[PDB]
Design a protein around this ligand. Structure first.
Ligand SMILES: [Ca+2]
Ligand SMILES: [Ca+2]
Ligand SMILES: [Cu+2]
Ligand SMILES: [Cu+2]
Ligand SMILES: [Cu+2]
Ligand SMILES: [Cu+2]
Ligand SMILES: [Cu+2]
Ligand SMILES: [Cu+2]
Ligand SMILES: [Cu+2]
Ligand SMILES: [Cu+2]
Ligand SMILES: [Cu+2]
Ligand SMILES: [Cu+2]
Ligand SMILES: [Cu+2]
Ligand SMILES: [Cu+2]
Ligand SMILES: [Cu+2]
Ligand SMILES: [Cu+2]
Ligand SMILES: [Cu+2]
Ligand SMILES: [Cu+2]
Ligand SMILES: [Cu+2]
Ligand SMILES: [Cu+2]
Ligand SMILES: [Cu+2]
Ligand SMILES: [Cu+2]
Lengths: 278, 278, 278, 278, 277, 277
């Protein structure tokens, strides 16, 4: 499938809730917070009203990258758009199509791989909240962008992936030929290099080349730093087959620390040849 | 919006390297008016620049430029004997070229882009002292037909500082909604950083703006950079988001927490910023 | 200049992993002829390479490749028994493919690009020990019609060193004004770097050369990179700048001060280098 | 209370290195009961200790101790062939000695003090990965006449963790007013730290207590420490300040913010803690 | 002179006010809070009731190092000893002399160079209130401790000295021979090394060797970290003469970025040889 | 051996010279600059006139920690006590014995493990000259201090030891029983922790306990920051035997990155068991 043209006014409920161990997550239903927060998907032109509720004892905010918003939905104490304990607030995100301005230039549309995160827990820049788990993916699709069979979000948050304990994945399963979307977000203090075995993508907006004239480097490794976000779509096992295809940060100490995980690609019968959790 | 013309002019300027307060050092076009960053040098592709340089300090100094064409005699390094002695004078010559087809059928990249110059001999043979002290500044080379901006602002991440300013002192930049605002982003020193602008985004290519609908450049509001990286871009101030104190900062979390933040102050036509208390 | 042909050949080469003087490890094509970096492997899109590999050491080793197509059996990891035992042999198979349109209508990125290979098992299960000891080398896969260079040099930033050489000891590379020179830049280990070349600049895309007037890729003389990053470019030596000893170095200030520096000795036709006192 | 007797005993003990939940690894004197911090070893000066060591893991491990006497054979390094291969055994032998007047007129420092042991070969030849996984424990060597404590609690700062415990999960320790509580403080990892204790203070000397009115050691409640530092002290719980939940934490602000905090739960004789409601 | 025996009950008012540019300081009188907060001196044995008053619109607290206080005066939120906006509270600090315990041990006295600071603003550990400036020095003297001609407090708070902007001192003035007391506190995120040109001290409780039997290292340079505190007294210009004697953090980027100051030591005739600011 | 009473007037010539790979060092003879610079030993009471020669193209200085010096030998641009390019200047260091003052307090002597370094190259705090190699050790001995068989200086300068490339030691060799003196200085930007295998020392002036009454902690691991110096003496292999005894920074990545060296202790014959270089 392909993404339609957008322009719908959408509405969703979000909650910030504490989780086990000092963690904090966003969710769509309450008691259902997740780290990372729920995937938000929009087509260019859509408006999203986030009816936001802070179920915690400390203030929290919701700040987004890439998308259009007014200063009232910045999500910062500096602009007084945070949410006091037990409070509620409507965060409005807008998105727009690319097009030709009157001056002759081309306006960049909103499409891309983006993210949202806290901006006031711990510090005026959300360092505690981000640490605590208050981050999530946002995909904005352009008319005609190819839709995946599945989307998986991988966040390098300091020395952890998705705030999971070290050496605990997460793992993603696919079958050969699946079109699999990866959303990649980085947070915290450190730079990282995200690597995938057996697969590769184009370093551009969609992670796929537009055609034979796209000169974007094709890569399997990409340096990123805090609040970087990119994404891509690969064909699972393409030209390489089924297997437990490793992905990991490729900074040596980081991978040794357990910033590693698995792309479990299965044949149609379900077999992953040679796979053997030790 | 203005457009840059074809270059090819031969230009001459004076430059001085001078001690400033508190152990700092800056370049300047007029004696006694050094600044950090140094003066913005703008050229059209094909232009030549003779920098009639004078070292008013008690230590050898140099001028090394990125991206432009220069013979070894204008390298600005000790090992080429192209530094300038205490009190000395030297003419540094930069050239630029248009792109074009070589006789071999390959395409020769032009000089156009966002560039910079800095010291290369103070403290160490790589100008570690001079760079820390403030001996850096922006260089813009335009291609014919590049869109010209209403204003240009230079933002240098230098170690843990912005433009060698004390933590938490900006700098801030002012615009009116709809202004065409050019940002030149330079990094120097020891540390990687990520530049982030609230409410605004640009394309990750030469100009910061997409050439049209065929350009697959990732559109971003966040970019990792390390010492001597330079990029630039243009935005329409407030476009789709409205007036406000729009934060820009390093997004490395402790860096933002320690004062590597500033304000893109986008004003309404009446000169006011809703919800900004100065 | 010549151009690369279309690929499609089955190629075979033997490889060995030896201890080298002073606690280092290397890859070589013949026994006793191992280097750091290992030997350059050049393929054309579509070629298959069978690497017949022998671990001549007293410790397990592996051979993991970036970017190329391989089955899981050639992942080169202990995690799925693709590692080699001391004295053991194994055939690692690498395939490549041209770009082309998939049945689902999308553009499948080809294998062409600047890649590398390295160990994945010495020291740790991510080859931290092996890479630090020197177990890495370059792979270039060319696409039909790619311009062929007069020379290729590989510069690997490994921890605080260039090509495991001791600090302040190059390497230097020689060329003659007008030579078409190809650089392969590989990063490994723990740190981020910025690679910089005096006198020269390239396009930030697959080939490092702009495809023509419609390629909007930034033109750069400086690039941040992190562990397992690889890129490449070609430059016309001395183009628009003439002969000389042109520095390349990491631009992280402490890194260049510690001696992560070298020289691109660009010679006049008579063999001389103006301004180079050796 | 009691006093340490003169030492001089030859002691034997079994130690096991084994995995735990989440990639962790610990030392124990019994199988299946390995812990983090490892078991507390207590000796009187002159005592010898033979640790019959078993490595019940699939990776090599070793035992290296601070402060105590040992030959190169018990160094516990890969470089002195004193590590323990997977599933191997080894007798690690530590010796201790009283102070004394040497022949050459000088005073020989005794072994008494607060020490520690940790792995030295897991992950790197310096045990970087082993220490990270929890392979560390405290050794106390007492001098004849040293005051003995009611209770000993070990606090290890291991990067961002206390005793490899998840963030904000203590650990807490319970005392009664008047108890003589002995704290051992070890530090590991990459980061410096400042251990702080509400309600109590101590002497910055060997034992943590002033020898008498002539001892000029600083009395502190806060001291800076870094990787492999070890010290200890004794306090009288509640002495002059009463019962309560007295906090202890690293005082580096970001460290305490992310939950490097525990509690010193000092109860009144009747078991109550005034104003401490969970 | 020298310090006498302690044992007096003292009382003081202290205020938590807002200051210019996002600051927050403590002060003994309304409108005159300072960064660092005022100097509190006591003799071992004294009690101090601090009549505290939060004049801000966020909660504040007062938490002290070294001295004796009941949990009632921890000055922390989880111990409900913090202070609401507008709110008042009495914090009570006690000090004790050293002496031999009945147990046979030696009980360490209260004497030392300590400090107080917020514990609630921004985080449950006072991260914001410390950054904003809510810190100040407390000195507990033992009977017989020599008294100084002046005391100067120097706080490394992140990349600042006393929350003052980079390259702005502070500077302190003395005359050759003055007995100058220095109190040094560290806060925030960074380690530092405090260095003093021209002078040295003993790394012990008073910063002066007790005599020939004191093995304490004599230093001019000390690494410290957040909440560390120590002090010393020096004879200004002793063995070195007048001059603008720098003090600075010796972490190189810190000193380049402005963590520097001047101990301006004059001759009796008032001169500072070669000083040329 | 034991240090005598000082009081000699001593004179040395010191050169600052450029060295290969962008470095600079101090040397006692022309053309013989070294990193670390030469070891300067004095007995308490000695005066040292250092007749300094700047052979380089940049202003340079000599700044000493711990010892007595007038402001004209401070070694900073601020009062023009640097040395211009090609120029000369005589820096004078003095040192005094411990003694009691008329005010009854104890004046600590100059004795200790000290150091000298540039203060003007690159920045006003010598950040370039320090990183380039302009640093060296100063030992001031007290009458009665025991004299070592040898002295080795280990300088943690940023992420190097003695400006040497990573993983290149340096190693120091001794024989079991040797009385070995270690001088340890830190410079630059980072903190470190110095650790030595199989040996230990007292955290005090000399690194040796004064006797059974000295409560100084006995350690084998110590945190240090920029411009810190300390030192000690150990009996090579005492109680532990001959062996390749590793010393390293114990910050884990620093040790993994080669901040490591070997204390090669040989048996009376000259061999080191277990040592397979
Ligand atoms: Ca691109
Ligand atoms: Ca002491
Ligand atoms: Cu943002
Ligand atoms: Cu922000
Ligand atoms: Cu990582
Ligand atoms: Cu953000
Ligand atoms: Cu350069
Ligand atoms: Cu930054
Ligand atoms: Cu440069
Ligand atoms: Cu891998
Ligand atoms: Cu580098
Ligand atoms: Cu790899
Ligand atoms: Cu060790
Ligand atoms: Cu800590
Ligand atoms: Cu406290
Ligand atoms: Cu150790
Ligand atoms: Cu606290
Ligand atoms: Cu500092
Ligand atoms: Cu505190
Ligand atoms: Cu200084
Ligand atoms: Cu270190
Ligand atoms: Cu110094």
């Amino acid at each position: 499938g392909a993404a339609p043209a957008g322009g719908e006014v959408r509405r969703v409920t979000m909650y910030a809730e504490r989780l086990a161990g000092g963690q904090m997550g966003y969710g769509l239903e309450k008691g259902k917070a997740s780290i990372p927060g729920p995937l938000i998907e929009l087509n260019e032109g859509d408006t999203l009203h986030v009816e936001f509720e802070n179920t915690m004892d400390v203030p929290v905010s919701l700040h987004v990258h890439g998308l259009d918003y007014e200063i009232s939905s910045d999500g910062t104490k500096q602009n007084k758009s945070h949410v006091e304990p037990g409070g509620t607030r409507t965060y409005t995100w807008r998105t727009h199509e690319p097009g030709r301005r009157a001056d002759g230039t081309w306006r960049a549309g909103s499409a891309g791989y983006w993210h949202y995160h806290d901006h006031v827990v711990g510090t005026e820049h959300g360092t505690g909240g981000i640490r605590n788990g208050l981050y999530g993916p946002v995909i904005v699709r352009r008319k005609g962008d190819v839709l995946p069979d599945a989307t998986h979000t991988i966040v390098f948050n300091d020395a952890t992936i998705n705030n999971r304990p070290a050496h605990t994945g997460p793992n993603f399963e696919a079958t050969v030929g699946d079109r699999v979307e990866i959303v990649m977000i980085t947070h915290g203090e450190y730079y990282h290099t995200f690597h995938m075995h057996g697969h590769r993508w184009a370093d551009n907006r969609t992670g796929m080349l537009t055609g034979p004239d796209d000169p974007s480097q094709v890569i399997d490794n990409k340096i990123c730093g805090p609040a970087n976000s990119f994404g891509f779509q690969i064909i699972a096992g393409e030209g390489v087959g089924a297997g437990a295809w490793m992905y990991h940060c490729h900074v040596q100490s980081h991978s040794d620390m357990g910033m590693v995980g698995l792309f479990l690609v299965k044949k149609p019968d379900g077999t992953i040849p040679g796979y053997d959790p030790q």
